[PDB]
């Protein structure tokens, strides 16, 4: 059906930026009554999403006038001319036109500041979770910019993927970082079976891993 | 003013029904579409439905026929929403929106947690430096909430150490259960010399536990 590309997926911004955020349907949005069933919403953190513009172009009311919409065919575009506070979270087109109707992925509109590489902190198993036959190695990678990162865990020199759960902070409103926790978990067995534990975070600040790791044995 | 209540949080059995009402007021509840709108992290915004309150004229995205049953009372300006055969998957914010050519006012939401979990505190383990490292300036420390149900939890360390210190993982749901943490950054001047505590609050079984951060191993 009808696929609503968005890009970027991420806009960051210093406020007062003009922002741009594309939409492109993957097919047009005419509809038989001639019009155009292209909309925009946000919806902040907490909160359910908001319409901004309807039929492509049209402020729904009280939506700030600085957002404005244009396209037609299968490109359209929202407009923020002065980024503002209130301005910032995850931005949806959608198109009405079709059933079943459709939404974008989402431009998640953040600030922008200096690229910051994560303190990463690894953690082996507790005695007190052991004890019960857990196993969960943890990895905080605090504090860093852009949101995108990547974490690897190597058990032994090879990569584990299984058990891994990663949980992002949202940005933080100080000093608009982001950070992550990286859990692998594991039975006591497993955990006990190996000694070189290790969390890789590749980010932007960096064109070799961040490689934070215990030995088992030293633990 | 158009408001669409929704009816609050459910934790329901795997395979259980769900009905999620939506009370509409502010408006002829008649003349407008009642869309109904799946949201699950990491998948956006997904249409479900809609229906036409009075004529029962409904539109029901492919996949949720079988699945979703929309119902509408013009007496009460109530819409209803069926989901039968819960799963995990199912596990989302649910909205209703107010439809017509765009969706110009949603619900609040409902969250539909699925789970075969009694309710379960958390347990709770320390996160702290071991393995016969030195600290430098500043020690990164935590607590791994674990295996809880349902959400949510609070975790506060030493009462006021979100001075800020302090980041929280947002808990991701996983078997049914939950695993969030927290981490928090202290001067090593000031860890293990003094006491750094986690107090974690899991309200939903009147349960609190307070886990005081020692050094997992030589430091
Ligand atoms: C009035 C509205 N009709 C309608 N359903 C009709 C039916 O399928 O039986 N609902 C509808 C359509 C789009 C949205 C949007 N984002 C919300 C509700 C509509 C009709 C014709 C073109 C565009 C919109």
Redesign the pocket.
Same mark, same amino acid.
């Given at each position: 059906e009808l696929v609503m590309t968005q890009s970027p997926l991420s806009l960051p911004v210093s406020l007062g930026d003009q922002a741009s955020i594309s939409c492109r349907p993957s097919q047009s949005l005419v +509809?038989?009554?001639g019009?155009t069933?292209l +909309?925009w919403y946000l919806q902040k953190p907490g909160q359910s999403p908001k319409l901004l513009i309807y039929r492509v172009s049209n402020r729904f009311s009280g939506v700030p006038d600085r957002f404005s919409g244009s396209g037609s065919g299968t490109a359209f575009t929202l407009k923020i001319s002065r980024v503002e506070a209130e301005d910032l979270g995850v931005y949806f087109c959608?198109?009405?036109?079709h059933?079943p109707?459709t939404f974008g992925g989402g431009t998640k509109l953040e600030l922008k500041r200096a690229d910051a590489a994560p303190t990463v902190s690894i953690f082996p198993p507790s005695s007190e979770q052991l004890t019960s036959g857990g196993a969960s190695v943890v990895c905080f990678l605090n504090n860093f910019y852009p949101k995108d990162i990547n974490v690897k865990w190597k058990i032994d020199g090879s990569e584990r993927q299984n058990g891994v759960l990663n949980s992002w902070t949202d940005q933080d409103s100080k000093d608009s970082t982001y950070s992550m926790s990286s859990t692998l978990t594991l039975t006591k067995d497993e955990y006990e079976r190996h000694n070189s534990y290790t969390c890789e975070a590749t980010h932007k600040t960096s064109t070799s891993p961040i490689v934070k790791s215990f030995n088992r044995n030293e633990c | 003013r158009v408001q669409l209540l929704e009816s609050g949080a459910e934790l329901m059995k795997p395979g259980a029904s769900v009905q999620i009402s939506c009370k509409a007021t502010g408006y002829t509840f008649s003349e407008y579409?009642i869309?109904w709108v799946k949201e699950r992290p990491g998948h956006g915004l997904e249409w479900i439905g809609?229906i036409?309150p009075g004529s029962g004229?409904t539109?029901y995205r492919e996949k949720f026929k079988g699945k979703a049953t929309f119902t509408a009372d013009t007496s009460s300006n109530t819409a209803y929403m069926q989901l039968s055969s819960l799963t995990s998957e199912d596990s989302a914010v649910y909205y209703c929106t107010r439809?017509? @050519? @765009?969706?110009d006012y949603w619900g609040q939401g409902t969250s539909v947690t699925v789970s075969a979990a009694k309710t379960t505190p958390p347990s709770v383990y320390p996160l702290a430096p071991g393995c016969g490292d030195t600290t430098g300036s500043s020690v990164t420390l935590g607590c791994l909430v674990k295996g809880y149900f349902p959400e949510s939890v609070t975790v506060t360390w030493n009462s006021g150490s979100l001075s800020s210190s302090v980041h929280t993982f947002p808990a991701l749901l996983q078997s049914g259960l939950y695993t969030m943490s927290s981490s928090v950054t202290v001067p090593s001047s000031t860890w293990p010399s003094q006491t750094v505590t986690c107090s974690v609050a899991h309200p939903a079984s009147s349960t609190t536990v307070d886990k005081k951060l020692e050094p997992s191993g030589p430091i």
């Open positions: +509809h038989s009554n019009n069933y +909309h959608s198109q009405g036109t059933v109707y | 579409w869309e809609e036409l004229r539109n439809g017509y @050519s @765009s969706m």
